[PDB]
Amino acid sequence: SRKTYTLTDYLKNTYRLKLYSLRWISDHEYLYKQENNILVFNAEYGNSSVFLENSTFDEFGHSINDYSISPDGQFILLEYNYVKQWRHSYTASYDIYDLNKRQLITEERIPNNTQWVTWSPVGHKLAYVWNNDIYVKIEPNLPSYRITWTGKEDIIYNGITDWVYEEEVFSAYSALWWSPNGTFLAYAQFNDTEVPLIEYSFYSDESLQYPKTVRVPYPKAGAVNPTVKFFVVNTDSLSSVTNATSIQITAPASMLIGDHYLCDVTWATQERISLQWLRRIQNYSVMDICDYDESSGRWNCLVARQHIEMSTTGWVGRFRPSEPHFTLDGNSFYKIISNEEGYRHICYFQIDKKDCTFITKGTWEVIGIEALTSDYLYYISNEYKGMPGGRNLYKIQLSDYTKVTCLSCELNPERCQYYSVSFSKEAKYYQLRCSGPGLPLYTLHSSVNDKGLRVLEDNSALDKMLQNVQMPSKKLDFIILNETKFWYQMILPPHFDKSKKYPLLLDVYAGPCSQKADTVFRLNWATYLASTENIIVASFDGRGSGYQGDKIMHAINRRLGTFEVEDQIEAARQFSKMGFVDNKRIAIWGWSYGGYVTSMVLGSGSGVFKCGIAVAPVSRWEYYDSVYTERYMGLPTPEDNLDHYRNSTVMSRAENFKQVEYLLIHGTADDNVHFQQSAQISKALVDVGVDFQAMWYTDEDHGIASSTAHQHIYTHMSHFIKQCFS
Amino acid sequence: SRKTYTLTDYLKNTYRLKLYSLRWISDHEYLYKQENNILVFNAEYGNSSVFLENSTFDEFGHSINDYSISPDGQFILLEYNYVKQWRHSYTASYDIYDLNKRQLITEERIPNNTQWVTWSPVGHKLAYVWNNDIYVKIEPNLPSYRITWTGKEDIIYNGITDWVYEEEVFSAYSALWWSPNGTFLAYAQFNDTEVPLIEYSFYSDESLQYPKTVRVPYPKAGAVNPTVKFFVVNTDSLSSVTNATSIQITAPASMLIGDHYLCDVTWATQERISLQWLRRIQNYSVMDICDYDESSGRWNCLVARQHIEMSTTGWVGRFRPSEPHFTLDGNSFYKIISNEEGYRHICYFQIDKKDCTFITKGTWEVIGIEALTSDYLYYISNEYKGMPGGRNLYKIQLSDYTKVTCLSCELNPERCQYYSVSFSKEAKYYQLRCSGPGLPLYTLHSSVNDKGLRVLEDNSALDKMLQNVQMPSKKLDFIILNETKFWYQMILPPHFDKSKKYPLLLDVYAGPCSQKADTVFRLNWATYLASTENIIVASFDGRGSGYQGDKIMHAINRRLGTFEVEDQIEAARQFSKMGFVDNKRIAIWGWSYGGYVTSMVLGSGSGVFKCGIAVAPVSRWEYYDSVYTERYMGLPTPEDNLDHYRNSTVMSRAENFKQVEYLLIHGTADDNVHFQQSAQISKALVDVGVDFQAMWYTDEDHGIASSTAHQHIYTHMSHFIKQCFS
Ligand SMILES: N[C@H]1CN(CCc2ccc3c(c2)OCO3)C(=O)C[C@@H]1c1cc(F)c(F)cc1F
């Protein structure tokens, strides 16, 4: 028949998925950015109007990669000169455009190289970080206010996170939090003074005669961590002559005793804020709730109003302890915690009551609390059809927990089993985002009746196109390892025939709380490998997996590099026994953590895999950051878990590579998983006399995402798998 | 028949070449180190005696990788704790053993981490460098004498060279020169204060958590060079309370005007020393001759006694201006300079006479002045049979230049056409070292009659072995490019048949003044490729080549990356037209400069080569050191030669790689040709969409010589060529 999904189709993106990215600016309207201009839509009827003309900035004399509209509708922050840094951080230039007088504000503008800018939740206030310091701008055109004075590049961070807090705990560059009505501005301060530095070369443009040495504060497992401090300033009592006074919120005592982290900050009310602290041994976490003392200016976190969240089987939280969701009066909150059975469900807390009440339960987990009203609590779980690789929106009645209602399950069971949601400001309207198993589907509904208002995007255009091509099929199912059931998924070739014996590629990640077997629709490298190369691309979620309860997830506690890789081999070993697998041609590949596992699996001497590809893998945990590695491995000291830190390296298995064909790929500018980790993998192989393929990607980081590097690395890998299979 | 020379034979060294390394300690005896003990031989009769028993140091409690016997016979310098640095430099610990009292001297011993140690030419004096400073030890057991006090790691070097002087001009770490009778000690001082640094990561042992950044003062083309100063101290007028006074010898004026180098120091007499200076534009070089002023302590280099050596066609000297050889009275000297016809021959100088007299002439060149007596001058040239890839020892009568006599030519024309020689102290005896075309042959002779005394080693043992194996044959011959003849050599497979069509590998180097076509016997990778894989491994010496006169050598002046690569293609293009070459399977590979050419050739779009391998190549000249690059390319400024610096990069040709199969190999710790150069080659290929193979060698430098890396890199390459050919 016609043609297949080729590699060029994947790299050149000839089949484009359509999205529908809207931005709720109220409880009735959302902004729908189009390529040229920005519209404004009326959720109820759908009528729309141009918010601002595409031509409006024709002669701005600068490319604008991003806009940001004040919660006022009164102003537009314009971002340009974007210069990416790490996964989330980056700097840019900003100009504020007045929608009132339609004038570009030119006085007291924001500095260039600003690290972070953000409006207050309600007016048109501004808080930005520049040179690691925090500034506040009560008016778009008024002089700025210095909040902090201790900023020092690479040493002291104010309002922005350092490398590890950004990547590991906050997953953001920003470390500042406005209060509900913009009155207060809370922020964190990080001190990297004694954090060791990671140094690597950056070659830059050909014209750069001498390579530069990039050095960033990065604590590797067991190293000295950055320290943290919290402050809350009053953006209403700030002069222009006085130095704004930032009130510090310290403690708790149970955390000050030793190395700790600040893992969450969520405002309860106009004057109440909650902080969540975590010990370096991510076993024990403490949440404090502080009130602003009217006639003292300070903040008081009452003991008795704090809640301890710990774990005897593993660490706290999937990645970081859950986020609390406070009721209007802030006198109580809902948050996802682990079950007495080990399943993450919603617990209802009274700020001054020690015990909470689980409102949900069962052998499934609540992914996330999406919205809260005085009436209902909207959450997303994988309860439906009892399959953890699904996602549906549910709403539970706060008056009767017995009354839980799924709002996505039946909308279109055939095409959608994986939703994500986006509510308007008061949760009066919401947009459901279906991403599989069929083509992505975007629709709008209203919370009063959960009535379907209309389809925002059905990817019909993409569909029309995809019928002229032999697409691969996806099978989501499970197998049974001694009692427990583990899910897997296989990307099957067009006209798949269970009679024939296909070569198999095991796409692996297997990180703690990961999930490679789901119902999401994807047009990636696997699509091609199956559509054109007729290769089955499988994925198995074994011990360590997430969203299935701690008994499975914490299985690899203080024991990384064990069961999760062991089960990957087990899965393949079974896949081959299913009759449509040529057990003579079974390969495995993964990126990041998946690269670590690929290597561990190829070095297991299992004999199951013929060849494999590791892309930017981890070779030994003492090389990765503290926050991540220690959450699962504890500390690398002989009193804690050093022995296992040593038993789970890749180099220690080098000898067993004699039996396989291996391809090691790593970007030289990887700040996350340092090139060092692969430099130690190759050295071990060379010392053992093992031949293998290699490929470095100069100036590329953990993503190898630049246009040319991306197309280059998949082409190289495609050849590799073809060679190993044909 | 039996078997072939396999890859394992090459890597595991199953067929060992025998040598005969002796050390003349007089004009009648030499020391012959054996594995266990050290013997002493009587050149005349051959009788020998044990100089020191192998057991003598059984319980020294340290492995000794090297000995050094005083020109006294009285002492033995013992080297241990060897820690290699660059190509020549390294540090070690030293203990001196007294052969008189057979006692290990324990007082005032030499410091650990000593950079360089050396005896005086006659007694048992010692001069060593430690922490970049010079110390002198008049007695093995007496307190040391600080000569210099300005030493500063990576900034100021005293008595030892910095990176570039070591690698480029002196080809040694040592920068100190004793006078004939040990009275005076001359030394150079280098200042790297403003030399930019090259920085790269060194990952070290797996246990090293954070990679270290190695940084060394390295001037790249056009960068700021180190500056130099010369001093001569009197090791006889040194107290133990006073700070030794070092008299500086400066100028010349014609050199102080701008950037210059110190390219040679050779003592004439007990009180006379000669220095050779070279301008940064290695066009013009000045030799000063200085005498020690008896009643003034200072040194005077008389103008009038200095000689200018320049060149209008190219640079001065093959690599650095030749070394002068003074007559006993130091009132005249012989040195190899370029002919008026462009051929390097011996010129006779009177220290105060401007013009010299050429004693040799012809269309061949004098390789080197080996020995000088009041009677004859012994030199080595490639005059015999008129083939520049040969080497023979000649002696010319100083009384009649008409009387030149070859001393090696006829000894064994069949087996030996490439000799090197080693004279006893007074040139009363000499050892000839034949290294091809047959098996290496070592013999001893006496200068009075040039009588053959006896064979020292004939590699009979290796010969007996090699007859049980199908060895490859070597053909040395030339072709004719418009008038001129250029030599080539081919390593032919056993039972070669000019009827059959063999795949061909072009082994290339082609650096300025290089010579890949010679008559030397070698057991290397080529041996295997031909003996077992039946692949012809050729080598062609075209424009740029050396030992054939400047018309050929200076052809690539200020024009690297042009003719020398062009002719490599030309040679292959002819080789294919010789009927025993499968022009469908022609490959090319090279290391260093040969890697640069391989890349330039593969990016020429010639279509002649199918595949190729570049090992640690140079991609663009602005990346290599100043001294080397500028000697051939001038300065990278728009007023000099920047345009061509830019036209000869490898990246600029990236596009044309679409047509070939390429393998890029580079060591990550290469301090010479920085990994940067290949990081820029791969980046260019990725940006152009070209697929290729790669392989980095973690912690290996320009040599990739460590045991495991060495065996690893040839195995990988062997597979590559086989894939490309079979
Ligand atoms: N660097 C890790 C970051 N991360 C957690 C992100 C996150 C933070 C906060 C949060 C989250 C998720 O959900 C809710 O709140 C990961 O998921 C994996 C990342 C990883 C693992 C490896 F082993 C690698 F080698 C390389 C690598 F980047």
Partner residue opposite A210 with nearest CB, options B220, B695, B709: B220
Partner residue opposite B683 with nearest CB, options A198, A676, A698: A698
How far is it, in rounded angstroms, from Cα A15 to Cα A471? 12
The amino acid occupying position B513 is C
B38: nearest Cα among B58, B22, B26: B22
Q: Which residues line ligand 1 (CB under 6 A)?
A: A 167-168, 171, 319-320, 511, 592-593, 618, 628, 672-673, 702
Whole-number Å distance, alpha carbon B63 to ligand 1 midpoint, is 50
- Max distance between CA atoms of chain A, in angstroms, equals 82
Tell me the CA end-to-end span of chain B in Å, nearest whole number.
Answer: 22
Tokens 């399959």 sit at which residue?
A387
Q: How far is CA B656 from CA A696, B597, B600, in A?
A: 21, 15, 10
How far is it, in rounded angstroms, from Cα A268 to Cα A290? 9
For chain A, what is the radius of gyration of the CA atoms? 26
Tokens of A475: 């099978």
The DSSP secondary structure of B568-619, one letter per residue, reads HHHHHHHHHTTSSEEEEEEEEEEETHHHHHHHHHHTTT-S--SEEEEES---
- For residue B49, the tally of other CB atoms under 10 A from its CB is 9
The DSSP secondary structure of B307-348, one letter per residue, reads EEEE-SSS-SSSSSPPPPEE-TTSSEEEEEEE-TTS-EEEEE
Give the residue whose CA is nearest to atom 10 of ligand 1.
Answer: A319
Partner residue opposite A708 with nearest CB, options B201, B649, B686: B686
Tokens 């199969």 sit at which residue?
B661
**Sign of the dihedral through C-alpha A174, A176, A181, A182:** negative
How far is it, in rounded angstroms, from Cα A80 to Cα B489? 62
Whole-number Å distance, alpha carbon A168 to ligand 1 midpoint, is 6
How far is it, in rounded angstroms, from Cα A6 to Cα A15? 11
Interface of A with B in 674-703 (CB under 8 A): 674-676, 679-680, 682-684, 686-689, 691, 693-699
The amino acid occupying position A356 is C
Ligand 1 atom closest to the Cα of residue A170 is: 9
Let me know: does A372 contact A324? Beta carbons within 8 Å. no
How far is it, in rounded angstroms, from Cα B274 to Cα B352? 13
The DSSP secondary structure of A190-219, one letter per residue, reads EE-TTPPEEEEEE--STT-SS-EEEEEE--
- For residue B286, the tally of other CB atoms under 10 A from its CB is 22
* Interface contact A709-B686, CB threshold 8 A: yes
Q: How many CA atoms lie within 13 A of B339 on its CB side?
A: 18
Q: How far is CA B30 from CA A666, B50, B450, in A?
A: 55, 12, 18
Nearest chain B residue (CA) to A619: B206
The conformation of residue B160, written as its DSSP 8-state character, comes to B
Q: Has A702 been annotated as catalytic?
A: yes
* Interface contact B716-A691, CB threshold 8 A: yes
Interface of B with A in 598-637 (CB under 8 A): 620, 622-623
The conformation of residue A234, written as its DSSP 8-state character, comes to E
* Interface contact B209-A623, CB threshold 8 A: yes
Helix then strand then coil, % of chain B, to nearest 5: 20, 35, 45
CB contacts, 8 Å: B650 with chain A: none
Angle at CA of residue B36, ends B31 and B39, nearest 5°: 20
Alpha helices in A409-562 (DSSP H): 460-466, 525-531, 550-553
A549: nearest Cα among A236, A337, A723: A337
Element (H, E) at A338: strand A332-338
> Strand runs (DSSP E) across A56-208, as ranges?
64-69, 75-84, 90-98, 103-104, 116-119, 126-130, 133-137, 145-146, 156-158, 176-178, 184-191, 197-202
Tokens of B161: 């060279």
Helix then strand then coil, % of chain A, to nearest 5: 20, 35, 45
Q: Give the per-residue SS3 of B198-235.
A: EEEEECCCCCCCCCEEEEEECCECCCCCCEEEEEEEEC
Let me know: does A180 contact A121? Beta carbons within 8 Å. yes
What stretch(es) of chain A map to CATH 3.40.50.1820?
A: 1-13+468-726
The DSSP secondary structure of B495-529, one letter per residue, reads T--TTS-EEEEEE----TT----------SHHHHH
Q: Give the residue from B163, B198, B201, B218 with the most A CB atoms within 10 Å of its CB, the best one to mutate.
A: B201
- For residue B644, the tally of other CB atoms under 10 A from its CB is 17
Ligand 1 atom closest to the Cα of residue A592 is: 25
Tokens of B97: 């053993």
Q: Give me the residues paired with residue B22 across strands.
A: B32
Q: Which of A86, A218, A319 to mutate to test the pocket of ligand 1 (most atoms within 8 A of CB)?
A: A319
CATH assignment of A1-13+468-726?
3.40.50.1820
Q: Give the per-residue SS3 of B429-460.
A: EEEEEECCECCCEEEEEECCCCEEEEEEECCH
Q: Does A201 touch chain B (CB under 8 A)?
A: yes
Let me know: does B334 contact B350? Beta carbons within 8 Å. no
Q: Give the per-residue SS3 of B65-130.
A: EEEEECCCCCEEEEEEEEEECCCCCEEEEEEEEECCCCEECCCCCCCCCECEEEECCCCCCEEEEE
* Interface contact B691-A716, CB threshold 8 A: yes
Resolution for this experimental structure (Å): 2.8
CATH assignment of A17-459?
2.140.10.30
Nearest chain A residue (CA) to B664: A695
How far is it, in rounded angstroms, from Cα B261 to Cα B179? 22
Q: Find the helix packing angle between B563-576 and B593-602, rounded to 10°.
A: 70
Q: Give the residue from B207, B209, B218 with the most A CB atoms within 10 Å of its CB, the best one to mutate.
A: B209
* Interface contact B699-A687, CB threshold 8 A: no
The SS3 of residue A450 is: coil
Whole-number Å distance, alpha carbon A511 to ligand 1 midpoint, is 9
The experimental method, as deposited, was: X-ray
Q: Give me the residues paired with residue A507 across strands.
A: A589
Let me know: does B629 contact B649? Beta carbons within 8 Å. no
The SS3 of residue B291 is: strand
How far is it, in rounded angstroms, from Cα A7 to Cα A718? 8
How far is it, in rounded angstroms, from Cα A422 to Cα A22? 9
Q: Does A363 touch chain B (CB under 8 A)?
A: no
**Annotated catalytic residue, options A322, A592, A606, A718:** A592
* Interface contact B651-A206, CB threshold 8 A: yes
How far is it, in rounded angstroms, from Cα A712 to Cα B29? 65
How far is it, in rounded angstroms, from Cα B660 to Cα B654? 11
Q: How many CA atoms lie within 13 A of B430 on its CB side?
A: 26
What stretch(es) of chain A map to CATH 2.140.10.30?
A: 17-459
Tokens of B674: 């920085």
A92: nearest Cα among A71, A108, A75, A68: A68
Tokens 């290599």 sit at which residue?
B624
Let me know: does B132 contact B111? Beta carbons within 8 Å. no
